[PDB]
Amino acid sequence: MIQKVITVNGIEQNLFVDAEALLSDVLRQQLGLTGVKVGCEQGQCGACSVILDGKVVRACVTKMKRVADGAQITTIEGVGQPENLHPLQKAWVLHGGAQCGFCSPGFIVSAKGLLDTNADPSREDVRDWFQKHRNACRCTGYKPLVDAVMDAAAVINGKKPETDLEFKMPADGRIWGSKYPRPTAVAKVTGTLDYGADLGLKMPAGTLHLAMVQAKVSHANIKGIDTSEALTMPGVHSVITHKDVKGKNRITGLITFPTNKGDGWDRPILCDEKVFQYGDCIALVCADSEANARAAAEKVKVDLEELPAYMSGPAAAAEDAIEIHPGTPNVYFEQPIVKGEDTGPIFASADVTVEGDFYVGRQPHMPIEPDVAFAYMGDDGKCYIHSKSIGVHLHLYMIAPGVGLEPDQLVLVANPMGGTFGYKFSPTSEALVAVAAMATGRPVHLRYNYQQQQQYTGKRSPWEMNVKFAAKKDGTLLAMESDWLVDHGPYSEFGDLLTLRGAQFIGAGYNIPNIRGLGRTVATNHVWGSAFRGYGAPQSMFASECLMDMLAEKLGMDPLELRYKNAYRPGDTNPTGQEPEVFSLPDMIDQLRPKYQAALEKAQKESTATHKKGVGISIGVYGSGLDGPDASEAWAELNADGTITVHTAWEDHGQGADIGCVGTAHEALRPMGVAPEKIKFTWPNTATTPNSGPSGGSRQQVMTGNAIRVACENLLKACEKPGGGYYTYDELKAADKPTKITGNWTASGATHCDAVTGLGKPFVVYMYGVFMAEVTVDVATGQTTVDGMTLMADLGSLCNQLATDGQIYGGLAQGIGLALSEDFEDIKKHATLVGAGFPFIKQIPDKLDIVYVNHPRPDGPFGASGVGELPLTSPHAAIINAIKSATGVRIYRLPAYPEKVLEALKA
Ligand code: PCD
Ligand code: FES
Ligand code: FES
Ligand SMILES: [Cl-]
Ligand SMILES: [Cl-]
Ligand SMILES: [Cl-]
Ligand SMILES: [Mg+2]
Ligand SMILES: [Mg+2]
C-alpha cells in the first residue's frame, strides 16, 4: 500500500491505495466519485475520462503508480455541479447532448481538457480530439456534442454571454415542438444520475455481488457442476445453480404464435440439461465483491459433453440438422405473405425483372454501459428487480413463472440506463438476480463486463434474403417475391414476430399489388435474437431498397425517380393490404430532388482516379406500435404543492421518456397554464405505475403520448370550475373531489396480420423517410468514408426537436456502422467495441442533415408519429447504393468491409 497526497476537484485528498489499483476504481469506490463512468474497462470508450496534470486520460487503464504525489485530478464533479454548471455542461443541456447520458461526463471532462489547450477550436479540431481520446457515444451521432463544445468555447472566450447557454422560453409558453431541454439532462451532465453500477456501489454492506459461471462452448449436454473449490475462495457466500430455482427455470416468450412449432418455453434461466450458446449462464457465484465473485467463478468446474454447434441459419436449417431443442424442428416458424394475384405469371410477362440475394448480420447493440441489474427481498416480502428493462410489465410476466413467483410477489423497476437500442426488449439479468435474491434472502448485484455485454446479450438476428421485383418499362412495380431465413439463436422470444416483420416491410414504401413470400425462423447456437432498433426493417429494407436501385440501373432510370414513380399515393396499399395513413413520400422526394442532383454533381466533380465519390438513396418505413390494437395508460395527478405528476411506465433507454412525457403533458395541459417545470414524470415500476407498455416498436410517443394526453384532458375536466377557471388542490380536497385521474388510449383501428396470408392493419401510425448518403471510396484500400447523410423525415409533429434531432443523428450513425463495420460473428474477435467495428467520431460525418416534412397523423397525439427506429430502417441501403454509385460495384452482404469492397472492385 502507498499513501498518496493529491488534489481531486480542487480538494486535497489523503489517499491510501494499492500502486496497482486502477484510478477508475479508486475514484469510484474509494472516493465515491461515481460521475467517473466505466463502460468498456479497456481504454476504448472514454466514459472514464479524467484530467490528470493537464492531460485527458482514461482512468480505467491508469494505474495509481502513474499518479504522482501532488497530482491534480479533475472529474465531472469538479467541472461543475447542478447549481453551478460549467459552460460545457450548460451547452450540453441546451444542445441535447445527453440522451442516455452515460458518455456525457467523459465527453465534458475531455472537452474541458481540449479547451484548456485550444481555446478556439475548429469543429474539425473538436472531432480530432474526441477521436484521439476515444470518446464514444452510441446515442447522439456526435454532432450535438460538437455543437455543444463550440457554443461553450465561444462563451468561455468572451465572444458571447453565458446567458445564451440558457434556454429561452418561446414566449407564448409552448414547449411542444420546441428545444426545451430534457429534465434529466442536468443530472446526466453533472454525473449525479445513478446508473445500475453506480447504485451497486451505494448499496449497503451485506449486498452480495454476483459473477456468472458461463459456458465456454456453443452447444453441450451438461453432466454436472463442481463448486467445491469456489466455495473456499475469498469472500464467497454461495453458488447458485438450477437447483436453487423455485419455478420452471424457463423464460416464456409469452406471445409465441400458435403456428410456432415451439412452445416458447425453451430458454432456461440457469442451464440445467444443456448449453445452447457460448456464454450461457450455468451458475452464479455470490460474494462480498465483484472481483471476489469473478475470481471464484473461474474455479467452478462444469462437466460437459460438447455437441456439434450450428453457427448460422443455413446450417441449422439443413434438412438433416439435429434438433437443438429436442422435439422441436430447428425451423420452428414460417410466415407467408400472400397479397393479390399469383406472381409467377406476372414475373413471366413483365418488361423487366430483377433479383438479389442479400444478407444483414448479427449487429451488436454496443451501448456504452454494459448490462447491470440488482434484486432484493423487500420488507413487504416481495422480490424487487431493478435493471435495464425497457418493458417492466412485459418482463415481469416473462420471468415470474420461471423464478416461481406470482405477479403480486415480484416488482420490476427500470434504473436510469446507458442505452440499449433494443437488447433490453429481452430479459438478460433479471431472472438471474431474482433467483439469487430469493435463494439468499439478501440484496444481490450483477454487473456484466463488456465482453459479457457482447457475447451474452441478444443480437440483431441475421437474415439471409432473396427478393425479386417485376416492373414495367416506365418503372411501375407489378409484383414482388421474397424469401427470408431468420437466424434467431437458441431462444425463441419474439423470433416469430421478427419474421412477420419481413412480410410487413420487405418492399414497403411502394404500391405493390401482388406479393408472394415466405419467412422462416430457425434456432441456431449463435447468439439469441433480441430486438435491435428497426427490428426487421434494417434487414427487410436493405434487401428491397438495394433491389430498387438494381431495378433502376436495369431500366436506365434515376433511382430517385424510380422511387417517386412508385411511392405511396392515395388508393395504394402497403404490403399487408392496408392503406397508408398519410402520403408524404412524394413530397419528401420532391424536396430532396434538387439536393440529390447537386450532390451527384459534387460527386462527379470531386471524384479522383483513386477516390471515387458517390450518392445513394433509400426509403424507410416502420410502424409506431406493437401489432394490433395496442394500448397504453397514464395517470395525471395534481399534487398538494400545485405540481402535476404524470404517472407512466414509459421506459427510458435514453431516447427521451422524460421530455416526451413533460412535452406531451404540457401541451395537453395548456388550458390550465401549467409551466413545464411543474410537470413530473415517474420512473417505470410495475407496482406503482400503469402498464404503459414497453419502449419497443417506436411506440411510446404515439401510445403513451396519447394516454398522457387523455389523462391530462381528464385532469382538466376534474379541475375545471363551472363558469371558467380551475380549482386548486386545496379546493378539490376540501370538496372531497379526486386529484389523481386516469387516461387510456387504444389503437382501435389496428388488426393483427393473418397467419396464412400476412394481410392486416398491424399499425395505425407509421414513420416515413428518405435517406441520401454521400460517400468516398478509396479504390486502393476499399475503405469507404461517409461524407454526409441526409434524412427527409415525416414525424407528423415534433414533441421535442432536441429529442428527434438526436434520435435521427444517432440512428444514422448506427446505420454507418451496420453498413461498413459492425458485426458479431466471431465470439472472440467481436467482443470489444473496437473489434466489433464501433463507429468513433471520425467515422460519422459532421454533415448530418434533417429536413422535417411533417404530415400530422390522424391517430397520433397532436399529430405525432414515433421517431425512434425510422433513422435505422435503411440508411445502410443508402450507403451501399452510394458505394455502387461511386464505383459501380454492389455489396450484397453487410458489412462492406474494405477487403470485401476490394474483392468486388477487382472482380
Ligand atoms: N414525433 C415525435 C416522436 C418522438 N419524439 C421523442 O423521441 C423519442 C423516441 O420516441 P418514440 O419513437 O415513441 O420511441 P420510444 O418508444 O420512446 O423508444 C423506443 C425506441 O428508442 C430508440 N432510441 C434510442 N435512443 C437512445 N438514446 N437510446 C436507445 O437505447 C434507444 N433505443 C431505440 C429503440 S430500439 Mo426497439 O426496442 O429495437 O423496437 S424501439 C426504440 C421520445 O423521447 C419522444 O418523446 C418526439 O419528440 N416527437
Ligand atoms: S475507456 Fe475506460 S471505461 Fe471505457
Ligand atoms: S448519450 Fe452518449 S452513449 Fe448515450
Ligand atoms: Cl432485429
Ligand atoms: Cl457481397
Ligand atoms: Cl477488411
Ligand atoms: Mg396506380
Ligand atoms: Mg480476399
Short mmCIF file of C-alpha atoms in Angstrom, two decimals, residues 2-8 11-16 67-72:
data_model
loop_
_atom_site.label_atom_id
_atom_site.label_comp_id
_atom_site.label_asym_id
_atom_site.label_seq_id
_atom_site.Cartn_x
_atom_site.Cartn_y
_atom_site.Cartn_z
CA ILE A 2 1.18 3.61 -0.54
CA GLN A 3 -0.01 6.95 0.77
CA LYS A 4 -0.58 9.47 -1.97
CA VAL A 5 -1.47 13.06 -1.18
CA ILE A 6 -3.04 14.61 -4.30
CA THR A 7 -5.71 17.18 -5.24
CA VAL A 8 -9.03 15.95 -6.67
CA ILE A 11 -9.63 19.45 -2.72
CA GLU A 12 -6.60 17.80 -1.09
CA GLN A 13 -7.09 14.08 -0.78
CA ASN A 14 -5.02 11.88 1.55
CA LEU A 15 -5.24 8.65 -0.45
CA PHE A 16 -4.29 5.12 0.65
CA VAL A 67 -0.34 9.29 -10.40
CA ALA A 68 2.39 11.38 -8.91
CA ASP A 69 2.40 12.65 -5.36
CA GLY A 70 0.88 16.12 -5.69
CA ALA A 71 -1.01 15.39 -8.86
CA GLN A 72 -4.12 17.28 -9.91
#
